[PDB]
Structure formats: C-alpha cells, structure tokens
Amino acid sequence: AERVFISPAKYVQGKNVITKIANYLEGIGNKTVVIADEIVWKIAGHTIVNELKKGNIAAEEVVFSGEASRNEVERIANIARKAEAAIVIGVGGGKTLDTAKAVADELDAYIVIVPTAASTDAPTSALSVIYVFESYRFYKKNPDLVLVDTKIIANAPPRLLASGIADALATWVEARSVIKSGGKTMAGGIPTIAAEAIAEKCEQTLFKYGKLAYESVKAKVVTPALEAVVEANTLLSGLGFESGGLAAAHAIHNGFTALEGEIHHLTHGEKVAFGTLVQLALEEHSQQEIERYIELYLCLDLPVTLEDIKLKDASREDILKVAKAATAEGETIHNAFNVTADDVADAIFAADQYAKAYKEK
Amino acid sequence: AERVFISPAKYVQGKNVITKIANYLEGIGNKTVVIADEIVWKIAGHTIVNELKKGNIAAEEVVFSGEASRNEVERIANIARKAEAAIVIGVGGGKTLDTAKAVADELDAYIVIVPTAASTDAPTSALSVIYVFESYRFYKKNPDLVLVDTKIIANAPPRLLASGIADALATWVEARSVIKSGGKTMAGGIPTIAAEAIAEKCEQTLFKYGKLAYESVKAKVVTPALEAVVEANTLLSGLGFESGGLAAAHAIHNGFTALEGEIHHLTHGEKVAFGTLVQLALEEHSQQEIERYIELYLCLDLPVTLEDIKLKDASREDILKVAKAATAEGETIHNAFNVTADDVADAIFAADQYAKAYKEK
Amino acid sequence: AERVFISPAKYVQGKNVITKIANYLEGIGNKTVVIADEIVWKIAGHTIVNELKKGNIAAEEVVFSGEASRNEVERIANIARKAEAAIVIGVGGGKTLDTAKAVADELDAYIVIVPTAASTDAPTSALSVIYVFESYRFYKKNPDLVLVDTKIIANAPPRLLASGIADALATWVEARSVIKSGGKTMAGGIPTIAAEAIAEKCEQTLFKYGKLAYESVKAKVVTPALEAVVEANTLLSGLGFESGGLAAAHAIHNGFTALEGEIHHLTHGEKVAFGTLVQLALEEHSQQEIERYIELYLCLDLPVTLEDIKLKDASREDILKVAKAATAEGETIHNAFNVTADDVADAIFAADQYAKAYKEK
Amino acid sequence: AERVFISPAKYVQGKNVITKIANYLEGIGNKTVVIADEIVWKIAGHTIVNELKKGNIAAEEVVFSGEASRNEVERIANIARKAEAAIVIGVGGGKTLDTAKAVADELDAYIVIVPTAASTDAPTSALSVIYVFESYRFYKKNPDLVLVDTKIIANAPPRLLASGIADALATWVEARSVIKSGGKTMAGGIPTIAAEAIAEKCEQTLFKYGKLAYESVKAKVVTPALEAVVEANTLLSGLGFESGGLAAAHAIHNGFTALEGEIHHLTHGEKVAFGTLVQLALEEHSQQEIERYIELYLCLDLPVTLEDIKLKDASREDILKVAKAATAEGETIHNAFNVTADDVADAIFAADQYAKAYKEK
Amino acid sequence: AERVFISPAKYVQGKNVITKIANYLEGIGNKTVVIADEIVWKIAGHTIVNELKKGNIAAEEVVFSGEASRNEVERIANIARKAEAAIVIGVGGGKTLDTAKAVADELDAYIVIVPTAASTDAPTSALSVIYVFESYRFYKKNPDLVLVDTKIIANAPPRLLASGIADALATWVEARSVIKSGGKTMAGGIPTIAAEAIAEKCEQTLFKYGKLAYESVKAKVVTPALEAVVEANTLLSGLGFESGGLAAAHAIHNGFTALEGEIHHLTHGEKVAFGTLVQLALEEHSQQEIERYIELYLCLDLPVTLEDIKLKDASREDILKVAKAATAEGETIHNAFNVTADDVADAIFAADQYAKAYKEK
Numbered sequence A, B, C, D, E: 001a002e003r004v005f006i007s008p009a010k011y012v013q014g015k016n017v018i019t020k021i022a023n024y025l026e027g028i029g030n031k032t033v034v035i036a037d038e039i040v041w042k043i044a045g046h047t048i049v050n051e052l053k054k055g056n057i058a059a060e061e062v063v064f065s066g067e068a069s070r071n072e073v074e075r076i077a078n079i080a081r082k083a084e085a086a087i088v089i090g091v092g093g094g095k096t097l098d099t100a101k102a103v104a105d106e107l108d109a110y111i112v113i114v115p116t117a118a119s120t121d122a123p124t125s126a127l128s129v130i131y132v133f134e135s136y137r138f139y140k141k142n143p144d145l146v147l148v149d150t151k152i153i154a155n156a157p158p159r160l161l162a163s164g165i166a167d168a169l170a171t172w173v174e175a176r177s178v179i180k181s182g183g184k185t186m187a188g189g190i191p192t193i194a195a196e197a198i199a200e201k202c203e204q205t206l207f208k209y210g211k212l213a214y215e216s217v218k219a220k221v222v223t224p225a226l227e228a229v230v231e232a233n234t235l236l237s238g239l240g241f242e243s244g245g246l247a248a249a250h251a252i253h254n255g256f257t258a259l260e261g262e263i264h265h266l267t268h269g270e271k272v273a274f275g276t277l278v279q280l281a282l283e284e285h286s287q288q289e290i291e292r293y294i295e296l297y298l299c300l301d302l303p304v305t306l307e308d309i310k311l312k313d314a315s316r317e318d319i320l321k322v323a324k325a326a327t328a329e330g331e332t333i334h335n336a337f338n339v340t341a342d343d344v345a346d347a348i349f350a351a352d353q354y355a356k357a358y359k360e361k
C-alpha cells in the first residue's frame, strides 16, 4: 500500500517571535484579518496588530464570538471579503484556531496560526471535529505558517502546559499501535518511516524534559527544556498523530461526549491522559511499563482515575455509553484493535483499578 | 534563537501510484501542463497524460529542451498561460524538476513533482543552485505534491539508486555537524528536534537496507527494503538536509565546478560520496568509524579515491582551486567549521589516502 | 477472541523405543493392522510385527500401495474390518502416515504413528493436504500415540534430516507473523502463549544443535544433539505450526504445485526452505538477519536459489503462476499479509537475488 | 587553530611537607621574604620561618594588611628589595596569594605558593581578577613552586573544603562546554587533549571521594580520600579551568559583584556552586542529570537556591543586574554560549525553581 | 608519601606556528642565539631567523657540531655570552635539543624548544642521558616554551612519526606499572592523579588515531588525526613518563648500549617498541592483550623480533649483557619489578618468540 505524509508549510518557534510577524509576511501581502476572543486581544492580539501597522500592513480586527459555528465563520468571512484581506491570522486556543482555518478555506487565503498555549496538537493539522462527537472533517490544506512564541507560552497557566504534554504522550502509544497492525493514518495511507521517527522521538523528549518544562512555566521563564517540550507538544505531536495514526486513546476521548456533566470542564489533554491509560490496559504491558506513565501523570497533576475525571462511582451503564460511542463505526480504535464495546467498558474500569493500586502504594 | 521547519505539503509513495494521478488532482482543477524530456515521455510521460485524459483532465504536453535556463522557463510558462492551465506537472530528473518548479512560481500554479529515479534529495525542496556554482536560490514554496512510484524506480539503472543512497548518506553527517556547532540550516534558523530525528533515522535506514535495496533494483523488483530506501533517499534526506543543515560535504561538491574535465559526467551523488569522506577527515573520528562508510560505498560501487572521481594524479594547484571555491564566502562549510582553503586541500588528499589504505587491506 | 490449542494424546521418543510397542499397547487391545510400504517393511515393519507377536498381539500385515487415495483407504479399511482390529499402526513416510490416519477415522480406531525419518512435522498433526494443491482437510483427532525411535532415524539418509530441519525452521518465522498480525491458526483461534513458547524454542534449538545433529546422522550415531533436533523437527515444529499458525512460507510451497517439472522430486522440506527465504524478503529484516538463515541452509546443503530448486532462468510468467496459486483465496498467506500476486512474484525473485549476492561473497 | 597548555613549574603535595621547605629551596637561594596575615602567621607562618632558619635561610617576616591593593604590593616589594631577597613565599588564602604573585613579578623573584585551605583553584594559576568585577589580568608566569600540606588542610574548617569542591565541580562543566563550541581558553588557544583528560578526571574524582574527604576533615584526619580531593581541588581544577576553559558558571559568579549585600560574605566556592546550576539550566540535560549535582551539593551543605545565597525574594530587576554583568562584553560566557542578558536572568530563576522542586521531594 | 608533578611552562602546537615566534617572544627580549645543525638550518633554521629579524630581534646563528658534548656546550655558551643573548632557541632533533638545554642552564637563559619531528618525548622534559648508558641527569628546569609546528612535522619522514608513536606507546605501560607497585617517578615522588589521567589518555589516543596519523604523514598533509597524535607523542608522552614513571621498557632500551653493532642505527623509538614487548612478557597478560600491541607495531612497520632489531641468532651471552645492564643498580626497572638479570634475559627471548608466533599466523 501507499505511504502518505502531510505537513504545514512552515513552522517557526522561539522567544518573542511574535515581534517578527510583519517580517514573515513580507512577500505575501499587506491586508489581513486578525481573529481572537476578548481575553486574547489583550494577551497578544493588540501586540500583533501594532507590529503589522509598523510594517504598513492593514489589519481588520475581529472579535471571535466564542463558538466555532458555521454562522460565526460566515460572519467573519464577509468582513474579510469586504476588507479584501488576503491573509487570515488566528490567535488563541482551539475553537478560535479551527474557526480561523474554516475562514481561510472560504477565502482561499494564506493562513497564519499563532497559539497562546501549547495545550493540544491541533495547531499544525489539516483537521477538526464535527460534533456528541460525530466525525472528523478535513480542511483543504494544513496551515501555511504556524508561529509559536515561547515567551507567551511561559506565561500561560501551568495546567495548560500539562494538558499539552498529556495530549502529546498519546502520540507514540497510538501511532505504534497503528504501525504494528498495518492500519491507516488520518493522512490516508500507512505510516511513513518519517512519522514513526517523529512520534517515537516525541515520547523520548517528554520523558526527558517534561517535568523541567512544567517547573519552568510555574516560574514563568523560558528554558531549553521548555523549548524542547513546546516543540514536542506542537510540531512532533502534530505530525505524529496526523501522519502517524490515531487509535484507542482519542476514541475514548470522543466517547466521553456521550455523557453530560462536569467532566466537560476538563481540557482535551486531561481527558486524553485517562484515554491513554485505557489503551495501555487493552494492550499487553507489564505492571512496570504501565506505572511508568502513571507516575509521570501524577507528577504533572493530571487525572488517572474515574474519580479524577468527575465520574466517581459511575455505573456500568454509564461506562457502556462511552464504550459504545468509542467503538462506533468509523472511530479510530478500529485502526488498531478488534474489540467490542464490552471489552472497552472492561478496560475503562481496569485502568481505574490499576491506577488506584499504584496510588495505594 | 528561532527554530524553523519547512516541508512539501504532501508526499505519496507506493508501487504504481502514478496510476492514481487523476485521483489526487480531483478538487484542484482540470487543466494541466506536463513537462518532460524526450526519453521520459516514453518512460512515464505518456502514461501520465493517458491517466489524466481518462479523468477528463486536459494536458498540454511540453518537451523539455534539456537545459534549465531562464529562456526555457519563459518559453514553457507562456504555453501554460495560453492553455490557462492551473497545475504544473514535472516528470523526470533534476533539471526538469527544477525547471518545473521555476515555471510553477511564475504562474502561481499548484505543482506536482514526479521523480523517475531516487537519485538525489532535490525533489521535496524549495531550492536550487545558480551556476561554476554561484549560489543557492529559493523558490516561493516547497512542492505541493511529490509522487513517488516505486515500480518506476525499480526499473531505473542501479547506478542511479546507488547515487541517491550516496546523497542521502551525507544527510546525518552534515546535519549532525550543524547541530553541534549551533549553526543555521537552509530553512533559516537552528535545527528543530524533528529534523534531527529524521536525519538520524535516515542514516540508520540506509545502513540497514541499502544493499538489499541495491540488489532489488538489479533484479527490477519492488521489495520492503526498496520502499524503505526510496523513502530515505527522498523524504528523509530531503527534509534532513533542508531543515537539518548543510556543511562541508556539499560545499566540496560545489567546489568541483571550479574544474573542467571528465569529473563532470559523474552524478551529483557520486561526487557527494567523496565529499562526505572529506568532511569525515576534517572531523575527529577513529579509523574504524571512517572505514564503516568506506566499506558501504565500495559495496555500492561508489567512488572513494581521487582516481575514482577522474582526478588521478591531480596537482596541489588543482586541488587548491576546489578548496578555494568550497570555502568561498557564503558556502555552507562555514555553518559548521572554521577552516581555511589550505586545511580543506589537505583534507581532500587525506581522504584519498585513507581510502587507498583501506583498499590495500 | 478465543485461543485454541490442540495436541496428539501422547508423544514418546528415545533410542530403540520401537522395542516397547507391545508395552505401550497393553490396556488398549490385542488385534492390530500394520501399514507400511515394501521398503519400510524391511526397515522396521517386520521388527514391529515380531514385537507385537511376542506380546500375543495379533497383527494384520498390510503393504501400502504407495498412493494415498480414497480407494487405497477403502481397501485397507476393509481388511482391518475383517480382522476386527481395534488399533491401526502406520509406519514410514508422509503418504503412509496420512493414509493410516484416514483409515483410523473410518474405523474410529486408536492410532499409533511411527515415523522412520524426522523429515516433516506432519506426524503429530490432525491434518493433511487435498490436491495442484486444493485445500487443507482435518481428521477427527490428532494421533493417539506418536512413537519416535532415534536409532531408526540416525540410520535414515542425512538429506532427510536436513529436510526436517528446513520444515522446522519455518515454524517460528510463520507463527511469529500470525501472532503479530492477530490472525488465526489452523487449530481455529488466535495462538496461545504455549504455542508461542514452543515455536520460539523450536528455532533456538535448531540454531544451537542443527549442524551437530546433521553430523551425527552422517556417522549413523545417536547423540544428545540428535535427540534435541528430532524433538524439534517433530513435536515442537508440529505443535508450533498447527497451534501457532501458518503464513507465507507454506503457501509458497503449495504454489509450486502449479508447475510441472523436476522441482517435484525435491522433498517437502527443501521446498519450504526457499519458501521461508521468500517470507523473510516480504518482511522488514536487515541484511544480516536474512543471511543468518541463508548461512545455516548452505551448511545443511539445502536450496537457496531458483536454480537450486530446478527453476533456473524461470520466466516471469512461470513465477506468476506460483504467486497466483500462493495468494489464492483461502491460502495461509492472508493470515499475516496483505499482498497481491505481483508482490509475491517480486519477493520470489528478490530472495533468489539476495541469496546469489550472499554466495558471491 | 593553535592549542596551548600552561602550568606551574612544580607541584608538591603530602602530609607535613611544609617541614621540607628548606630542602626544596636548596639550589635556589638563602634570602627570602615571607608574606602572611596575622591569623596565618600563627597557623603556619612561624613554622615556615623556623624551618628556613634551621637551613641558614634568611627570612623577612611581612604581615599582610589584608587588602590586595597596588599600594600594599608596592609596600611589600620595597621591603624585599631592601632585604635583597630572591625568593617570595606567600602563605594563606586568596588575597595573600595574589598579592604574593604581584610582588614576585616586580622583583622577578622565584615564587613559592603555600595554601592553608583547598578552597579555590587559584593557587596554580597565572591570573587574578581586577575589580564590581572589571576584568582578568595575567601575571608574567604561573608559580614556580606550589606546596600543599594535607595536614594543614585537614585542620582547616570543613566549610572551606566544601567550598573548594564546589569550585572544582565547575571545571568539567565549563571546559566541556568550551571544547564542544570550539571556543578559547584563558591560556590563549583551543583546549589540548591533556586539559580535557585532566578536567574530566577532576569530576570523576570528586564524585568518588568528595563526601569521604569532607568527613575526613570533620574529624581532622588525613586519608587517601582527602589526598585525592585536595589534588583535584588544586592541581586538576587549576589546570582544567586555566588551560581547559571558563564559561557561564564563573561569569555568573562575577555578575554577583553587581549587587551589594550579605551575599558577599559567602565564599568564592559557594557562589560558584549556584553558578554551575545556572550553566546546567542553560544546557540540554535531563532532570536526572541535573539532580545528580544538586544531590552532591546538599550532601556538602552547599547552597542551591536563591534563598541560600542571601537573595530570597529577589526582584526581576535585581537579577537582571547580575545577568547584564555576566553577559558583559569580554566575559567568559561568550566562549561557549550565544545568549542575551534576558536568557540568563531566566536561567537564574529556573535553577532556583529546579532545586526547590528537588527539595520538595 | 609526597606526590610531585612538574611541567614545561608553556606548550604551543599548531600548523605554521613557527611563523609567530617573534610574537611569543615579545615581552621577553630582543637578542637570541639559535642552535641547529646543517640540515635543519635549511628545513626551519633560516625561516626562524627571518621571522625574528622582521621583529627587530637579533639572532646569533650557531651551527651544531652534531655531538652533544661538554666542549660543544662550552663553545656555544661563549658565543651567546659574547652576543649577550638572553634567549636560547634549539631547533631539530634530540642531540641538538639536549645541547640547547645544557646551554640555557649555563646562561640562566629563557629556552625555546622547537622540534622538527615528533619522534621522542624528550622535548618537554627536564632531563637527559649521560653515557654505554651511565645515568640520567636533570637540568635546572623544564623548558620555558615548547613550539610544535604540525606543518613541519607532516613533512618529516613517516619513519620518524612511527618512532614517536612507539616511544609514546611505552608511556601508559610503564606508568601503570609504577602506580601499581607504589614506586617513584623521575620527578621525585609517587605519581599524581593528573599524571595517571594523562598517561592513560596517551594510549587511548594512539590506538584511535595512530594509523590515520601515519597515513597523513605519508601524504604530507596536516589533519585532526595528526594533530592529536603529535600532541600525544610530545605533551602527553612527555608529562606521562617524567611525572608518571619509567620502568622496564626504557631500561631495556638502555641495556642495548652494552652491545656494539648495527642495532645502533635504529631510532630511540624503534628500540623502545621491542623494550615494551619485553615489559609485557614480564607481566601477567593474556595472549590477546599482548597481540593487540604487536598488531599495531606491524601496522606501523616497527620492529617486533630480535631479527628486526639487528640481533638475529644472538647468543644467550649477548642477551645476558643487555639484561645485566638493564638491571643495573639505579635503573628504572627496579621501580616496578623485583627481577634478576636471568629473568630479564628469559623475557627478551619470550617476547621474540611470542612475536614470531603471531607472525606465523
């Protein structure tokens, strides 16, 4: 079969790089539209507009409603049309970035992605989720330019870095399972050797620098350990999951949308952490190998029990709902496993039990 | 400093994938221009046009003159203009592919790169050489789609695969030296961890499957070993040198343009092999480490002495010309070394001597 | 899914154990039918009858026609009926043993299997081949008693021991591929941990004692090395392939029945050797790993090139016939691979080429 | 480039060697000047004069004022002139030893250096610091004779040995960084292989015997462990930093002179310990590698947090002053790093944070 | 006991450093005397004078007679007196360098040592041999400046580099034996840890780069391998033997002066090679360990049998003369061994026999 690898055109990371935005946009154009929510306009939004003005680059300032819906995308796309802007700049978290990508596809515009936290690996990807999760949709392209300012990230909450590490720790576990079973990746074919090298390196980097990166953020300072972890959470994890493959961990994350409740205040990363423990319980690992992950999660104050994810004393019936959704036709778990909803419900309680046993030590 | 990574938008590799060209071009357009020389039109050119016709995709058939000059690029660009084609397809070797990239930049067209041999790592890159070498020039983008058909490659001459392996064996040696010295890559910043993982994996893959891949080609068959080496020669080596960094090996290759003679009938890869031995002689390696490379080159019938590269009994004055050109202001050797032309002339004769000593064993 | 393990009821091996046949049949019965061809009646047949007589055990002496057909089975089954024998004893090579198993199923009789060479792992199994290969058929049970006399085997031709080692060297290669891909075994389910331990031990035993066992046979002596290899060729290889899984190697063996010619004078083992090299060429192994097997085969004077298997200068069309038969619907290659006939034809020429390259060293 | 190695002419170490001073000065002369402060005259000063008298060697007894200034040097140099002494003997700590070296240069006299604690590696060097640090100045030569009496040192305060170990633990960390980056040493060229072997051995010796040496001193006894550590703190650390190279650790030490306060009562060694943690935070080390150093420092009661160095709750503005001074033009940090004052301020808070995290365990 | 380390004040090595001689002599003086024989005046002598003139430095040109005798030293010392030169510069081989050292001691002059081959480790030392060897004599100091130009050395005969490697390969073997037995070094006390680190590193460097350095010289080029070996042959080997200790190898070298004949045309290094094999035969090494040295010697065309050292078919009586001289009272063999002349005669024939046995393989 065919191997396929896709990637954003350019990735740039460093301390204060947001100050060179006008530089990177030189031979591209002079009119842009900038999208961000109220909070982010203060954090980095105004700084970006000011830098663009200094370079004679026009900038239509849009305030993201907060909901990534078709309407909001139609609303913002008209504004850009009117201003006849040829460059779209999305700044902030997940919803804002997906919306910015939808907008760029409508205008066939050059898109710049500027995350304000290294909390998920969605930044570099060509895809998003259509919701209770319903399916994955692809955009026409991966972003043209992803700009990551470590200074901004060293100021974001420590919990958001821990979340990004959790999402990135799922990368090798899931890709490895797709490679072994000969399944397909989101990109369309079997994994390339390039994606395998990137996903495996992603895990080694997190285990080596993860904790030092977490401490750096607590003190709001930029260090080599933080630079390495931010690259892992963004570029390695991004290419690794997209071109390396998804499996059970993210299917479990999706399965949680089948329930209502406080669990939905947790970040994408915190849900993925527990989901990763569930994939490990469905595989053949020794106790020491599983505890190696549990230990790192606790060090980063991430959730490892059903109680931690707001599902204390959940019923078998509740867990079966999650399991049925996670094993739905078309979910990624099928790319690497042959399991039934009942097998998965069983694995959810086993992971909870394994973690409690570790804590009781 | 800032780390930068760039990449072609999509890479697709597999046996007979050329038969799905119309498929990959679906939501892109229906009018294209196809560029190839006389020989390649027979090898794969007509097959591509026929596949495009089957899908109602128009195809202006251009015959590459054979010289990648501004004129040829202006000539072909007009034809595409007239046909109002929105897709450029380059098929064949180096010169044809660079020309196709120049043409796509003029029309701001979507570009598909289809190599007919895995002989150099130029396919995925955003750059070319301006000649006696004068400098490196960047195109506006890395290719949109790189399509690699292993079946076509298993039929190309064994010497061209060996050449591609030689060019790819320079990747880790050069990138490693840039990473250690803190120098910059062609992409603009310091190397990312992603590029380091890819370049190091590139070398491991070649040492493991290189010979089996060479034997596969001799018998004109496609095997897993050939699929791995073709990916290394193209995607790993491509990203590795561009986003990982160049150093002395390719500067020596360029320095050979300072001489006239039969050496210029050798392939880019065969010249890079000797150039790699020269960088190793300028570094601090034990005898066993250098011989590890010499042995693999001989197994692939690649050149390892001045005599093999058509410079038998060359004079110190001749070698100094190569050395002066290789250490020119702006060459890549400066990204990782602090050496003079005289040091480099000395290293050229040492590599020759080390190789003869090995052969005399 | 369910894991399944099956086995013959009892396996007995040792020097001169044929002399205790009357002992093992004590509480079973006193009337038997003994099946063997003309040559084997001399080798061990008469010795068995004589031992049974000494114990007051009746013995109807049947002379196997030489062709394992439904008619021969009906013929022999009547004789046993008439003699009202409750025990069937098959002695000799493959065809005789399969026939004896067919006969025992008709009479619902206790069956004793006594091989006179350790040349294939069919002895302990519950199955046979229905022929140009057409399919695998199961008997109602695995044999009740398998009796292996190392003294008899130390006198059989060295070529037959080498053949048995070849067939046994396919066991781990094939089982490992079924375990990794999650496919099924001949026994019906996924492999047990028991079968995995047995198949892996089978390979370790052959590499450690194979050559010493081969030399023992050349001198017609029984040694610990011979006892270990005879157990590997019979009990380990038998349980390993049946309850561990078949894959590409034996499918290639079957694919050879699609051709006519001198290749059909080779033993089952000699054909399996080449078939094993083909599965390794379809997998991802380094040159050193493949050569480890090639070297051992040459040491045992087993075939490793198309020329050795009587297919010198075979045409692509001839090889495609073998490939099409080997990838037929229902063949075992599908339990561990997703390949086309063309992929397999390519792997057949690669194995030939890899082996020649090794010899040219 | 050129490699350069410099060294004191002779180094002598052992228990009670101060008793053979008259012996070592035999064929040199009979008139000397002895420099020491009030406290040291009691500790070893009078013992040295008495030993010199026994050998008919004249000895002008000078009492060091306590401040190493040009005036004090002019004062003492006249006295030696008047006495027409051809040998200068400095006894005691840092300031006295530097002054003695300045005095010997004025008279072109033979100089003997006799430390009374193994607290810094200044003894063997040809240099001193010109102060708020302003620059490094070289003397005309490295000392002629360095005499180290382990008995005297086993009686000095344990805190001074711990200080010497701290200063010596910076040697390999700094030299290794200069070697990797191709920078220069204080001696003038790139490091020799000799200096690399000495600096690396220095670290291995401290990790093996450091704690046993510390306990020996607490009990005021001379042991092989103490003899090894005293040699590391004096001869290995001395040659290692001078001919091996300085980098960030000592630049941070110098940067502290930009602040006023109680921090200035700490020893040179205690400040270097924290400075070493800062260089490690600017490099790419895993958590375990950094903790290996933190653990040893705590075992020796050395400082590892800003609070320990009297800078509890220091302001970003205060830390920036240290950072600006440490990255001044001409400081040693530039021999191995490309960093800004802001990067260094960030590394100072990271080291503090890493250490607190370790303690909180 | 006391540990003692001595060293030349400054060591400088690099390509063409002879061109900066006037630079290094800046604040020292302007009148010098230059000593060299007829051949060396052409090789480097005139170049040195010319460089000194360019810097307004006077230079009395002396032609070394060729015999290092008291008379020649008195002759040259007068000339320097008359010219009132304050700097002595010795250029060339052994005898010239020792003479220059004797001359500097008479005038109490600053001495610069400039070797034209890296053939022995006498350059940095404070000692010479008084001859049939009679004893070792010390000079008043180790040299002030040792200047090693790798360009000059890359032009000296390959045999002289091999000789220097042989002399340097004796360093660790001899020092290790003194360290283990608790004996003394030439410097006066037991070995320091610094000397042990240097001597051990010396051997590792030779085994890693020795052959590459030998090939570099054959082609007359300067490489990193040559720079490393020249430092080992000069600075590491020099400090290692002087401050690390001599033992049996050099005592055997001295013992050869008891015989007359062609053996005396061999270099100091070639005699030391055989002497090293003899010390190894007197120690407890396995066959593989001894062959590791024999193999390297043969690769460098150094002598390993009595026949190679011009003593073919020597008589027991002849060998006893060498043995008696080598075990003389006061020789260095006693620093590490308790052996009789008869034991040593026996070891000389064993080494010869071991080497022949290796060659006969």
Ligand SMILES: [Zn+2]
Pocket (backbone or CB within 6 Å): A120, A121, A167, A250, A268, A272
């Ligand atoms: Zn995720």
Ligand SMILES: [Zn+2]
Pocket (backbone or CB within 6 Å): A261, A262, A265
């Ligand atoms: Zn809520």
Ligand SMILES: [Zn+2]
Pocket (backbone or CB within 6 Å): B120, B121, B167, B250, B268, B272
């Ligand atoms: Zn290239």
Ligand SMILES: [Zn+2]
Pocket (backbone or CB within 6 Å): B261, B262, B265
């Ligand atoms: Zn030509």
Ligand SMILES: [Zn+2]
Pocket (backbone or CB within 6 Å): C120, C121, C167, C250, C268, C272
């Ligand atoms: Zn079989």
Ligand SMILES: [Zn+2]
Pocket (backbone or CB within 6 Å): C261, C262, C265
């Ligand atoms: Zn036939």
Ligand SMILES: [Zn+2]
Pocket (backbone or CB within 6 Å): D120, D121, D167, D250, D268, D272
């Ligand atoms: Zn210090």
Ligand SMILES: [Zn+2]
Pocket (backbone or CB within 6 Å): D261, D262, D265
């Ligand atoms: Zn105070």
Ligand SMILES: [Zn+2]
Pocket (backbone or CB within 6 Å): E120, E121, E167, E250, E268, E272
């Ligand atoms: Zn010597």
Ligand SMILES: [Zn+2]
Pocket (backbone or CB within 6 Å): E261, E262, E265
């Ligand atoms: Zn002679």
